[PDB]
PDB file of all heavy atoms in Angstrom:
ATOM      1  N   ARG A  41      91.267  88.479  89.100  1.00 38.60           N
ATOM      2  CA  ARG A  41      91.751  87.354  88.192  1.00 38.60           C
ATOM      3  C   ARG A  41      90.820  87.269  86.991  1.00 38.60           C
ATOM      4  O   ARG A  41      91.204  86.575  85.955  1.00 38.60           O
ATOM      5  CB  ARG A  41      91.862  86.085  88.981  1.00 38.60           C
ATOM      6  CG  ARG A  41      93.151  85.997  89.786  1.00 38.60           C
ATOM      7  CD  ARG A  41      93.058  86.888  91.046  1.00 38.60           C
ATOM      8  NE  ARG A  41      91.959  86.338  91.916  1.00 38.60           N
ATOM      9  CZ  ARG A  41      91.540  86.926  93.107  1.00 38.60           C
ATOM     10  NH1 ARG A  41      92.075  88.132  93.468  1.00 38.60           N
ATOM     11  NH2 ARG A  41      90.636  86.404  93.676  1.00 38.60           N
ATOM     12  N   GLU A  42      89.688  87.806  87.011  1.00 39.23           N
ATOM     13  CA  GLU A  42      88.695  87.691  85.913  1.00 39.23           C
ATOM     14  C   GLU A  42      88.582  89.051  85.189  1.00 39.23           C
ATOM     15  O   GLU A  42      88.242  89.063  83.988  1.00 39.23           O
ATOM     16  CB  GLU A  42      87.267  87.295  86.451  1.00 39.23           C
ATOM     17  CG  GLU A  42      87.324  86.005  87.187  1.00 39.23           C
ATOM     18  CD  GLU A  42      85.889  85.656  87.613  1.00 39.23           C
ATOM     19  OE1 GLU A  42      85.291  86.459  88.226  1.00 39.23           O
ATOM     20  OE2 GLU A  42      85.391  84.509  87.420  1.00 39.23           O
ATOM     21  N   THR A  43      88.946  90.174  85.811  1.00 38.99           N
ATOM     22  CA  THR A  43      88.956  91.459  85.205  1.00 38.99           C
ATOM     23  C   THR A  43      90.438  91.969  85.031  1.00 38.99           C
ATOM     24  O   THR A  43      90.642  92.946  84.245  1.00 38.99           O
ATOM     25  CB  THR A  43      88.067  92.447  86.017  1.00 38.99           C
ATOM     26  OG1 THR A  43      86.853  91.862  86.242  1.00 38.99           O
ATOM     27  CG2 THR A  43      87.917  93.763  85.382  1.00 38.99           C
ATOM     28  N   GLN A  44      91.349  91.331  85.833  1.00 39.47           N
ATOM     29  CA  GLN A  44      92.665  91.765  85.758  1.00 39.47           C
ATOM     30  C   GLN A  44      92.754  93.246  86.079  1.00 39.47           C
ATOM     31  O   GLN A  44      93.607  94.010  85.555  1.00 39.47           O
ATOM     32  CB  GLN A  44      93.352  91.589  84.357  1.00 39.47           C
ATOM     33  CG  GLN A  44      93.319  90.036  84.025  1.00 39.47           C
ATOM     34  CD  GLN A  44      91.880  89.631  83.533  1.00 39.47           C
ATOM     35  OE1 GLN A  44      91.311  90.299  82.741  1.00 39.47           O
ATOM     36  NE2 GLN A  44      91.349  88.546  84.129  1.00 39.47           N
ATOM     37  N   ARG A  45      91.901  93.706  87.034  1.00 36.38           N
ATOM     38  CA  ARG A  45      91.801  95.039  87.471  1.00 36.38           C
ATOM     39  C   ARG A  45      92.114  95.181  88.924  1.00 36.38           C
ATOM     40  O   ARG A  45      91.651  94.317  89.723  1.00 36.38           O
ATOM     41  CB  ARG A  45      90.345  95.581  87.190  1.00 36.38           C
ATOM     42  CG  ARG A  45      90.281  97.049  87.636  1.00 36.38           C
ATOM     43  CD  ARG A  45      88.815  97.418  87.497  1.00 36.38           C
ATOM     44  NE  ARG A  45      88.295  97.335  86.100  1.00 36.38           N
ATOM     45  CZ  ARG A  45      88.462  98.228  85.219  1.00 36.38           C
ATOM     46  NH1 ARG A  45      89.010  99.392  85.519  1.00 36.38           N
ATOM     47  NH2 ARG A  45      87.980  98.073  83.933  1.00 36.38           N
ATOM     48  N   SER A  46      93.049  95.978  89.225  1.00 33.34           N
ATOM     49  CA  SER A  46      93.569  96.196  90.619  1.00 33.34           C
ATOM     50  C   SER A  46      92.361  96.325  91.600  1.00 33.34           C
ATOM     51  O   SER A  46      91.367  96.891  91.316  1.00 33.34           O
ATOM     52  CB  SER A  46      94.383  97.452  90.738  1.00 33.34           C
ATOM     53  OG  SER A  46      94.676  97.720  92.108  1.00 33.34           O
ATOM     54  N   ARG A  47      92.564  95.727  92.775  1.00 34.69           N
ATOM     55  CA  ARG A  47      91.525  95.670  93.824  1.00 34.69           C
ATOM     56  C   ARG A  47      91.677  96.734  94.865  1.00 34.69           C
ATOM     57  O   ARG A  47      90.968  96.768  95.854  1.00 34.69           O
ATOM     58  CB  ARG A  47      91.510  94.281  94.541  1.00 34.69           C
ATOM     59  CG  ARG A  47      91.068  93.213  93.525  1.00 34.69           C
ATOM     60  CD  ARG A  47      91.062  91.820  94.229  1.00 34.69           C
ATOM     61  NE  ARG A  47      90.625  90.833  93.288  1.00 34.69           N
ATOM     62  CZ  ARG A  47      89.270  90.529  93.136  1.00 34.69           C
ATOM     63  NH1 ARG A  47      88.301  91.284  93.693  1.00 34.69           N
ATOM     64  NH2 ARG A  47      88.900  89.616  92.307  1.00 34.69           N
ATOM     65  N   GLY A  48      92.736  97.627  94.733  1.00 33.51           N
ATOM     66  CA  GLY A  48      92.966  98.659  95.666  1.00 33.51           C
ATOM     67  C   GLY A  48      93.959  98.286  96.769  1.00 33.51           C
ATOM     68  O   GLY A  48      94.119  98.989  97.719  1.00 33.51           O
ATOM     69  N   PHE A  49      94.661  97.224  96.596  1.00 31.73           N
ATOM     70  CA  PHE A  49      95.633  96.749  97.510  1.00 31.73           C
ATOM     71  C   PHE A  49      96.819  96.008  96.800  1.00 31.73           C
ATOM     72  O   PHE A  49      96.597  95.248  95.922  1.00 31.73           O
ATOM     73  CB  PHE A  49      95.023  95.867  98.578  1.00 31.73           C
ATOM     74  CG  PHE A  49      93.926  96.477  99.263  1.00 31.73           C
ATOM     75  CD1 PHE A  49      92.647  96.421  99.006  1.00 31.73           C
ATOM     76  CD2 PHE A  49      94.276  97.286 100.427  1.00 31.73           C
ATOM     77  CE1 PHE A  49      91.570  97.101  99.633  1.00 31.73           C
ATOM     78  CE2 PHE A  49      93.272  97.927 101.183  1.00 31.73           C
ATOM     79  CZ  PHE A  49      91.924  97.819 100.822  1.00 31.73           C
ATOM     80  N   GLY A  50      98.046  96.393  97.233  1.00 32.33           N
ATOM     81  CA  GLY A  50      99.247  95.843  96.587  1.00 32.33           C
ATOM     82  C   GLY A  50     100.482  95.944  97.504  1.00 32.33           C
ATOM     83  O   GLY A  50     100.426  96.697  98.431  1.00 32.33           O
ATOM     84  N   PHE A  51     101.457  95.085  97.236  1.00 29.74           N
ATOM     85  CA  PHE A  51     102.679  95.139  98.067  1.00 29.74           C
ATOM     86  C   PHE A  51     103.894  95.534  97.166  1.00 29.74           C
ATOM     87  O   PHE A  51     103.921  95.076  95.983  1.00 29.74           O
ATOM     88  CB  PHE A  51     102.906  93.759  98.551  1.00 29.74           C
ATOM     89  CG  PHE A  51     101.848  93.425  99.576  1.00 29.74           C
ATOM     90  CD1 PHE A  51     100.808  92.624  99.105  1.00 29.74           C
ATOM     91  CD2 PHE A  51     101.889  93.815 100.886  1.00 29.74           C
ATOM     92  CE1 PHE A  51      99.751  92.326 100.001  1.00 29.74           C
ATOM     93  CE2 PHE A  51     100.833  93.492 101.876  1.00 29.74           C
ATOM     94  CZ  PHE A  51      99.747  92.733 101.377  1.00 29.74           C
ATOM     95  N   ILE A  52     104.783  96.324  97.698  1.00 28.39           N
ATOM     96  CA  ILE A  52     106.011  96.802  96.909  1.00 28.39           C
ATOM     97  C   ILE A  52     107.172  96.628  97.822  1.00 28.39           C
ATOM     98  O   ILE A  52     107.196  97.066  98.958  1.00 28.39           O
ATOM     99  CB  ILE A  52     105.688  98.225  96.487  1.00 28.39           C
ATOM    100  CG1 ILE A  52     106.794  98.622  95.538  1.00 28.39           C
ATOM    101  CG2 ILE A  52     105.591  99.175  97.677  1.00 28.39           C
ATOM    102  CD1 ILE A  52     106.419 100.107  94.859  1.00 28.39           C
ATOM    103  N   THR A  53     108.227  96.020  97.292  1.00 26.56           N
ATOM    104  CA  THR A  53     109.516  95.778  97.991  1.00 26.56           C
ATOM    105  C   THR A  53     110.658  96.631  97.561  1.00 26.56           C
ATOM    106  O   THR A  53     110.836  96.811  96.285  1.00 26.56           O
ATOM    107  CB  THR A  53     109.894  94.333  97.954  1.00 26.56           C
ATOM    108  OG1 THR A  53     108.838  93.466  98.287  1.00 26.56           O
ATOM    109  CG2 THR A  53     111.147  93.987  98.846  1.00 26.56           C
ATOM    110  N   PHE A  54     111.269  97.346  98.405  1.00 25.76           N
ATOM    111  CA  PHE A  54     112.358  98.258  98.162  1.00 25.76           C
ATOM    112  C   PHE A  54     113.712  97.608  98.424  1.00 25.76           C
ATOM    113  O   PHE A  54     113.768  96.550  99.100  1.00 25.76           O
ATOM    114  CB  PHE A  54     112.271  99.533  99.028  1.00 25.76           C
ATOM    115  CG  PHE A  54     111.209 100.378  98.496  1.00 25.76           C
ATOM    116  CD1 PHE A  54     109.837 100.093  98.514  1.00 25.76           C
ATOM    117  CD2 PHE A  54     111.554 101.590  97.842  1.00 25.76           C
ATOM    118  CE1 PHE A  54     109.015 100.911  97.939  1.00 25.76           C
ATOM    119  CE2 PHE A  54     110.559 102.477  97.362  1.00 25.76           C
ATOM    120  CZ  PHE A  54     109.302 102.028  97.396  1.00 25.76           C
ATOM    121  N   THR A  55     114.788  98.149  97.822  1.00 28.63           N
ATOM    122  CA  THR A  55     116.144  97.686  97.955  1.00 28.63           C
ATOM    123  C   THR A  55     116.393  97.710  99.469  1.00 28.63           C
ATOM    124  O   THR A  55     117.038  96.698  99.978  1.00 28.63           O
ATOM    125  CB  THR A  55     117.104  98.663  97.233  1.00 28.63           C
ATOM    126  OG1 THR A  55     116.706  98.597  95.826  1.00 28.63           O
ATOM    127  CG2 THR A  55     118.497  98.251  97.380  1.00 28.63           C
ATOM    128  N   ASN A  56     116.128  98.914 100.132  1.00 29.16           N
ATOM    129  CA  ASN A  56     116.471  99.032 101.589  1.00 29.16           C
ATOM    130  C   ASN A  56     115.461  99.834 102.275  1.00 29.16           C
ATOM    131  O   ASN A  56     114.792 100.653 101.604  1.00 29.16           O
ATOM    132  CB  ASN A  56     117.857  99.591 101.775  1.00 29.16           C
ATOM    133  CG  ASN A  56     118.993  98.721 101.173  1.00 29.16           C
ATOM    134  OD1 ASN A  56     118.952  97.414 101.362  1.00 29.16           O
ATOM    135  ND2 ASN A  56     119.903  99.157 100.542  1.00 29.16           N
ATOM    136  N   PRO A  57     115.179  99.611 103.545  1.00 31.17           N
ATOM    137  CA  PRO A  57     114.112 100.372 104.293  1.00 31.17           C
ATOM    138  C   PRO A  57     114.226 101.939 104.049  1.00 31.17           C
ATOM    139  O   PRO A  57     113.238 102.589 104.127  1.00 31.17           O
ATOM    140  CB  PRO A  57     114.460 100.053 105.858  1.00 31.17           C
ATOM    141  CG  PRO A  57     114.984  98.654 105.705  1.00 31.17           C
ATOM    142  CD  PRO A  57     115.802  98.557 104.443  1.00 31.17           C
ATOM    143  N   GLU A  58     115.499 102.407 103.897  1.00 29.38           N
ATOM    144  CA  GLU A  58     115.630 103.755 103.606  1.00 29.38           C
ATOM    145  C   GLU A  58     114.912 104.191 102.208  1.00 29.38           C
ATOM    146  O   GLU A  58     114.316 105.239 102.197  1.00 29.38           O
ATOM    147  CB  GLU A  58     117.177 104.106 103.445  1.00 29.38           C
ATOM    148  CG  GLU A  58     117.849 103.264 102.312  1.00 29.38           C
ATOM    149  CD  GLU A  58     119.324 103.402 102.283  1.00 29.38           C
ATOM    150  OE1 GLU A  58     119.737 104.594 102.417  1.00 29.38           O
ATOM    151  OE2 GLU A  58     119.907 102.412 102.167  1.00 29.38           O
ATOM    152  N   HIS A  59     114.982 103.262 101.338  1.00 31.01           N
ATOM    153  CA  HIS A  59     114.369 103.496  99.952  1.00 31.01           C
ATOM    154  C   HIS A  59     112.824 103.374 100.159  1.00 31.01           C
ATOM    155  O   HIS A  59     112.098 104.193  99.586  1.00 31.01           O
ATOM    156  CB  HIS A  59     114.905 102.431  99.063  1.00 31.01           C
ATOM    157  CG  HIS A  59     116.354 102.615  98.860  1.00 31.01           C
ATOM    158  ND1 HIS A  59     117.011 103.838  98.613  1.00 31.01           N
ATOM    159  CD2 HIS A  59     117.422 101.803  99.058  1.00 31.01           C
ATOM    160  CE1 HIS A  59     118.379 103.670  98.720  1.00 31.01           C
ATOM    161  NE2 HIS A  59     118.612 102.414  98.973  1.00 31.01           N
ATOM    162  N   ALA A  60     112.376 102.467 100.947  1.00 31.59           N
ATOM    163  CA  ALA A  60     110.991 102.236 101.271  1.00 31.59           C
ATOM    164  C   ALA A  60     110.430 103.570 101.884  1.00 31.59           C
ATOM    165  O   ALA A  60     109.429 104.034 101.587  1.00 31.59           O
ATOM    166  CB  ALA A  60     110.805 101.063 102.205  1.00 31.59           C
ATOM    167  N   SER A  61     111.261 104.112 102.835  1.00 31.14           N
ATOM    168  CA  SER A  61     110.928 105.328 103.515  1.00 31.14           C
ATOM    169  C   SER A  61     110.710 106.543 102.707  1.00 31.14           C
ATOM    170  O   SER A  61     109.674 107.219 102.933  1.00 31.14           O
ATOM    171  CB  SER A  61     111.971 105.651 104.577  1.00 31.14           C
ATOM    172  OG  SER A  61     111.628 106.789 105.253  1.00 31.14           O
ATOM    173  N   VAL A  62     111.524 106.630 101.641  1.00 28.81           N
ATOM    174  CA  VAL A  62     111.354 107.779 100.747  1.00 28.81           C
ATOM    175  C   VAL A  62     110.099 107.687  99.967  1.00 28.81           C
ATOM    176  O   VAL A  62     109.330 108.680  99.843  1.00 28.81           O
ATOM    177  CB  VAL A  62     112.483 107.831  99.704  1.00 28.81           C
ATOM    178  CG1 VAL A  62     112.395 109.038  98.804  1.00 28.81           C
ATOM    179  CG2 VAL A  62     113.874 107.904 100.485  1.00 28.81           C
ATOM    180  N   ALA A  63     109.714 106.534  99.421  1.00 30.56           N
ATOM    181  CA  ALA A  63     108.557 106.339  98.602  1.00 30.56           C
ATOM    182  C   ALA A  63     107.299 106.678  99.423  1.00 30.56           C
ATOM    183  O   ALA A  63     106.513 107.513  98.967  1.00 30.56           O
ATOM    184  CB  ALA A  63     108.433 104.893  98.029  1.00 30.56           C
ATOM    185  N   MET A  64     107.115 106.062 100.577  1.00 31.34           N
ATOM    186  CA  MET A  64     106.008 106.439 101.461  1.00 31.34           C
ATOM    187  C   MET A  64     105.915 107.858 101.753  1.00 31.34           C
ATOM    188  O   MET A  64     104.919 108.525 101.770  1.00 31.34           O
ATOM    189  CB  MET A  64     105.886 105.564 102.702  1.00 31.34           C
ATOM    190  CG  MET A  64     107.219 105.624 103.517  1.00 31.34           C
ATOM    191  SD  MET A  64     107.251 107.001 104.591  1.00 31.34           S
ATOM    192  CE  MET A  64     105.874 106.511 105.708  1.00 31.34           C
ATOM    193  N   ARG A  65     107.202 108.383 101.949  1.00 32.40           N
ATOM    194  CA  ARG A  65     107.298 109.871 102.305  1.00 32.40           C
ATOM    195  C   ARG A  65     106.711 110.696 101.201  1.00 32.40           C
ATOM    196  O   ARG A  65     106.048 111.625 101.448  1.00 32.40           O
ATOM    197  CB  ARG A  65     108.763 110.214 102.559  1.00 32.40           C
ATOM    198  CG  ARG A  65     108.812 111.683 103.116  1.00 32.40           C
ATOM    199  CD  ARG A  65     110.337 112.053 103.328  1.00 32.40           C
ATOM    200  NE  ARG A  65     110.905 111.222 104.283  1.00 32.40           N
ATOM    201  CZ  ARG A  65     110.798 111.438 105.647  1.00 32.40           C
ATOM    202  NH1 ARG A  65     110.066 112.547 106.054  1.00 32.40           N
ATOM    203  NH2 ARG A  65     111.317 110.643 106.515  1.00 32.40           N
ATOM    204  N   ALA A  66     107.089 110.294  99.968  1.00 36.23           N
ATOM    205  CA  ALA A  66     106.579 111.050  98.736  1.00 36.23           C
ATOM    206  C   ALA A  66     105.378 110.629  98.161  1.00 36.23           C
ATOM    207  O   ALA A  66     104.786 111.187  97.295  1.00 36.23           O
ATOM    208  CB  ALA A  66     107.728 110.935  97.663  1.00 36.23           C
ATOM    209  N   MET A  67     104.745 109.477  98.684  1.00 36.71           N
ATOM    210  CA  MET A  67     103.520 108.939  98.081  1.00 36.71           C
ATOM    211  C   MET A  67     102.327 108.738  99.130  1.00 36.71           C
ATOM    212  O   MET A  67     101.208 108.663  98.746  1.00 36.71           O
ATOM    213  CB  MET A  67     103.834 107.560  97.435  1.00 36.71           C
ATOM    214  CG  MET A  67     102.658 107.107  96.616  1.00 36.71           C
ATOM    215  SD  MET A  67     102.248 108.244  95.264  1.00 36.71           S
ATOM    216  CE  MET A  67     103.505 107.632  94.209  1.00 36.71           C
ATOM    217  N   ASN A  68     102.692 108.733 100.441  1.00 36.74           N
ATOM    218  CA  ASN A  68     101.581 108.474 101.393  1.00 36.74           C
ATOM    219  C   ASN A  68     100.355 109.413 101.216  1.00 36.74           C
ATOM    220  O   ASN A  68     100.509 110.664 101.434  1.00 36.74           O
ATOM    221  CB  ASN A  68     102.167 108.638 102.934  1.00 36.74           C
ATOM    222  CG  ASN A  68     102.945 109.905 103.029  1.00 36.74           C
ATOM    223  OD1 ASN A  68     102.692 110.857 102.359  1.00 36.74           O
ATOM    224  ND2 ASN A  68     103.969 109.913 103.839  1.00 36.74           N
ATOM    225  N   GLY A  69      99.262 108.833 100.884  1.00 38.80           N
ATOM    226  CA  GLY A  69      97.982 109.659 100.641  1.00 38.80           C
ATOM    227  C   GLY A  69      98.179 110.499  99.344  1.00 38.80           C
ATOM    228  O   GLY A  69      97.573 111.577  99.249  1.00 38.80           O
ATOM    229  N   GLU A  70      98.995 110.088  98.394  1.00 37.70           N
ATOM    230  CA  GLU A  70      99.279 110.817  97.127  1.00 37.70           C
ATOM    231  C   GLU A  70      98.680 110.147  95.926  1.00 37.70           C
ATOM    232  O   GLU A  70      98.758 108.909  95.745  1.00 37.70           O
ATOM    233  CB  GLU A  70     100.747 111.067  96.995  1.00 37.70           C
ATOM    234  CG  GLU A  70     101.030 112.000  95.870  1.00 37.70           C
ATOM    235  CD  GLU A  70     100.500 113.376  95.956  1.00 37.70           C
ATOM    236  OE1 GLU A  70     100.271 113.764  97.239  1.00 37.70           O
ATOM    237  OE2 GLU A  70     100.263 114.100  95.053  1.00 37.70           O
ATOM    238  N   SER A  71      98.180 111.050  95.047  1.00 37.79           N
ATOM    239  CA  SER A  71      97.495 110.556  93.803  1.00 37.79           C
ATOM    240  C   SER A  71      98.413 109.703  92.911  1.00 37.79           C
ATOM    241  O   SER A  71      99.311 110.206  92.267  1.00 37.79           O
ATOM    242  CB  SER A  71      97.135 111.780  93.036  1.00 37.79           C
ATOM    243  OG  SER A  71      96.682 111.481  91.735  1.00 37.79           O
ATOM    244  N   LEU A  72      98.147 108.453  92.969  1.00 37.17           N
ATOM    245  CA  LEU A  72      98.772 107.543  92.079  1.00 37.17           C
ATOM    246  C   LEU A  72      97.815 107.087  90.979  1.00 37.17           C
ATOM    247  O   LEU A  72      96.786 106.642  91.265  1.00 37.17           O
ATOM    248  CB  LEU A  72      99.160 106.211  92.945  1.00 37.17           C
ATOM    249  CG  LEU A  72      99.915 105.196  91.965  1.00 37.17           C
ATOM    250  CD1 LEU A  72     101.318 105.782  91.665  1.00 37.17           C
ATOM    251  CD2 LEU A  72     100.053 103.884  92.696  1.00 37.17           C
ATOM    252  N   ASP A  73      98.253 107.506  89.768  1.00 32.60           N
ATOM    253  CA  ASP A  73      97.331 107.174  88.648  1.00 32.60           C
ATOM    254  C   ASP A  73      96.026 108.022  88.768  1.00 32.60           C
ATOM    255  O   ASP A  73      94.968 107.566  88.376  1.00 32.60           O
ATOM    256  CB  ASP A  73      97.184 105.744  88.365  1.00 32.60           C
ATOM    257  CG  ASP A  73      98.416 105.082  88.214  1.00 32.60           C
ATOM    258  OD1 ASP A  73      99.216 105.497  87.378  1.00 32.60           O
ATOM    259  OD2 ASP A  73      98.541 103.994  88.818  1.00 32.60           O
ATOM    260  N   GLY A  74      96.120 109.177  89.505  1.00 32.56           N
ATOM    261  CA  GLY A  74      94.988 110.072  89.727  1.00 32.56           C
ATOM    262  C   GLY A  74      94.133 109.648  90.859  1.00 32.56           C
ATOM    263  O   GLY A  74      92.963 110.074  91.045  1.00 32.56           O
ATOM    264  N   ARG A  75      94.681 108.721  91.720  1.00 30.40           N
ATOM    265  CA  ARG A  75      93.897 108.235  92.880  1.00 30.40           C
ATOM    266  C   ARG A  75      94.865 108.154  94.053  1.00 30.40           C
ATOM    267  O   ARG A  75      95.818 107.387  93.986  1.00 30.40           O
ATOM    268  CB  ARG A  75      93.252 106.855  92.656  1.00 30.40           C
ATOM    269  CG  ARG A  75      92.291 106.446  93.798  1.00 30.40           C
ATOM    270  CD  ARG A  75      91.711 105.098  93.468  1.00 30.40           C
ATOM    271  NE  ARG A  75      90.789 104.724  94.611  1.00 30.40           N
ATOM    272  CZ  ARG A  75      90.017 103.566  94.574  1.00 30.40           C
ATOM    273  NH1 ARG A  75      90.166 102.763  93.555  1.00 30.40           N
ATOM    274  NH2 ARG A  75      89.395 103.264  95.640  1.00 30.40           N
ATOM    275  N   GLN A  76      94.664 108.857  95.215  1.00 27.52           N
ATOM    276  CA  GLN A  76      95.488 108.809  96.279  1.00 27.52           C
ATOM    277  C   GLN A  76      95.594 107.456  96.861  1.00 27.52           C
ATOM    278  O   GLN A  76      94.518 106.811  97.136  1.00 27.52           O
ATOM    279  CB  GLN A  76      95.031 109.866  97.350  1.00 27.52           C
ATOM    280  CG  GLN A  76      95.181 111.317  96.733  1.00 27.52           C
ATOM    281  CD  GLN A  76      95.065 112.377  97.872  1.00 27.52           C
ATOM    282  OE1 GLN A  76      94.015 112.311  98.578  1.00 27.52           O
ATOM    283  NE2 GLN A  76      95.968 113.168  97.941  1.00 27.52           N
ATOM    284  N   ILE A  77      96.769 107.039  97.204  1.00 26.55           N
ATOM    285  CA  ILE A  77      97.033 105.695  97.871  1.00 26.55           C
ATOM    286  C   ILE A  77      97.875 105.958  99.173  1.00 26.55           C
ATOM    287  O   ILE A  77      98.641 106.903  99.202  1.00 26.55           O
ATOM    288  CB  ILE A  77      97.902 104.762  96.985  1.00 26.55           C
ATOM    289  CG1 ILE A  77      99.133 105.605  96.326  1.00 26.55           C
ATOM    290  CG2 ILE A  77      96.937 104.216  95.808  1.00 26.55           C
ATOM    291  CD1 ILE A  77     100.041 104.619  95.763  1.00 26.55           C
ATOM    292  N   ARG A  78      97.637 105.020 100.113  1.00 27.14           N
ATOM    293  CA  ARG A  78      98.299 105.204 101.342  1.00 27.14           C
ATOM    294  C   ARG A  78      99.495 104.159 101.463  1.00 27.14           C
ATOM    295  O   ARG A  78      99.240 102.987 101.456  1.00 27.14           O
ATOM    296  CB  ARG A  78      97.350 105.034 102.489  1.00 27.14           C
ATOM    297  CG  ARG A  78      96.417 106.216 102.547  1.00 27.14           C
ATOM    298  CD  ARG A  78      95.495 106.176 103.828  1.00 27.14           C
ATOM    299  NE  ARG A  78      94.669 104.923 103.804  1.00 27.14           N
ATOM    300  CZ  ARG A  78      93.388 104.943 103.290  1.00 27.14           C
ATOM    301  NH1 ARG A  78      92.944 106.038 102.664  1.00 27.14           N
ATOM    302  NH2 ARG A  78      92.741 103.795 103.198  1.00 27.14           N
ATOM    303  N   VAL A  79     100.695 104.708 101.538  1.00 27.82           N
ATOM    304  CA  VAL A  79     101.791 103.864 101.749  1.00 27.82           C
ATOM    305  C   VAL A  79     102.278 103.723 103.117  1.00 27.82           C
ATOM    306  O   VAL A  79     102.903 104.710 103.697  1.00 27.82           O
ATOM    307  CB  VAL A  79     102.950 104.399 100.845  1.00 27.82           C
ATOM    308  CG1 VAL A  79     104.068 103.439 100.722  1.00 27.82           C
ATOM    309  CG2 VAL A  79     102.506 104.688  99.357  1.00 27.82           C
ATOM    310  N   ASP A  80     101.983 102.657 103.784  1.00 26.17           N
ATOM    311  CA  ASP A  80     102.394 102.343 105.146  1.00 26.17           C
ATOM    312  C   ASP A  80     103.535 101.370 105.190  1.00 26.17           C
ATOM    313  O   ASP A  80     103.394 100.216 104.703  1.00 26.17           O
ATOM    314  CB  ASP A  80     101.210 101.772 105.960  1.00 26.17           C
ATOM    315  CG  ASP A  80     101.641 101.523 107.414  1.00 26.17           C
ATOM    316  OD1 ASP A  80     101.820 102.516 108.092  1.00 26.17           O
ATOM    317  OD2 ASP A  80     101.643 100.310 107.739  1.00 26.17           O
ATOM    318  N   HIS A  81     104.682 101.810 105.485  1.00 25.32           N
ATOM    319  CA  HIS A  81     105.947 101.111 105.500  1.00 25.32           C
ATOM    320  C   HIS A  81     105.839  99.824 106.281  1.00 25.32           C
ATOM    321  O   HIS A  81     105.722  99.899 107.566  1.00 25.32           O
ATOM    322  CB  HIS A  81     107.164 101.964 105.860  1.00 25.32           C
ATOM    323  CG  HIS A  81     107.043 102.496 107.219  1.00 25.32           C
ATOM    324  ND1 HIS A  81     107.320 101.776 108.439  1.00 25.32           N
ATOM    325  CD2 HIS A  81     106.480 103.633 107.741  1.00 25.32           C
ATOM    326  CE1 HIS A  81     107.105 102.493 109.453  1.00 25.32           C
ATOM    327  NE2 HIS A  81     106.605 103.697 109.126  1.00 25.32           N
ATOM    328  N   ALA A  82     105.922  98.635 105.700  1.00 24.42           N
ATOM    329  CA  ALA A  82     105.887  97.395 106.369  1.00 24.42           C
ATOM    330  C   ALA A  82     107.143  97.253 107.256  1.00 24.42           C
ATOM    331  O   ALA A  82     107.029  96.747 108.424  1.00 24.42           O
ATOM    332  CB  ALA A  82     105.876  96.262 105.394  1.00 24.42           C
ATOM    333  N   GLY A  83     108.278  97.804 106.807  1.00 23.41           N
ATOM    334  CA  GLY A  83     109.564  97.732 107.549  1.00 23.41           C
ATOM    335  C   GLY A  83     110.068  99.062 107.884  1.00 23.41           C
ATOM    336  O   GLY A  83     109.781  99.547 109.025  1.00 23.41           O
ATOM    337  N   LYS A  84     110.776  99.755 106.967  1.00 26.48           N
ATOM    338  CA  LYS A  84     111.427 101.075 107.278  1.00 26.48           C
ATOM    339  C   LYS A  84     112.388 100.970 108.498  1.00 26.48           C
ATOM    340  O   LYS A  84     113.309 101.816 108.508  1.00 26.48           O
ATOM    341  CB  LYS A  84     110.268 102.074 107.711  1.00 26.48           C
ATOM    342  CG  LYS A  84     110.911 103.522 107.792  1.00 26.48           C
ATOM    343  CD  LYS A  84     109.819 104.596 108.162  1.00 26.48           C
ATOM    344  CE  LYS A  84     110.371 105.877 108.355  1.00 26.48           C
ATOM    345  NZ  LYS A  84     109.271 106.847 108.619  1.00 26.48           N
TER     346      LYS A  84
END
């Protein structure tokens, strides 16, 4: 809140669990902005 710089954690909501599933499928442990992020589906 003082640097407005991501802390390494965030939440993302999909239209449907199926859509959520694809993103984690294509992003789990994948370089996001040059840094791998782990997408663990909250729902799916």
Side-chain angles (χ1 to χ4, degrees):
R41 277 78 62 186
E42 298 181 312
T43 306
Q44 299 80 45
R45 184 186 300 273
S46 170
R47 290 181 180 277
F49 298 94
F51 297 93
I52 187 170
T53 305
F54 283 67
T55 299
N56 296 320
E58 60 187 315
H59 300 308
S61 180
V62 181
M64 50 88 68
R65 186 181 297 277
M67 190 65 78
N68 49 30
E70 186 63 25
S71 174
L72 180 70
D73 301 313
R75 186 179 181 180
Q76 300 192 304
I77 49 163
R78 291 190 295 273
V79 188
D80 182 67
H81 61 87
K84 185 179 180 180

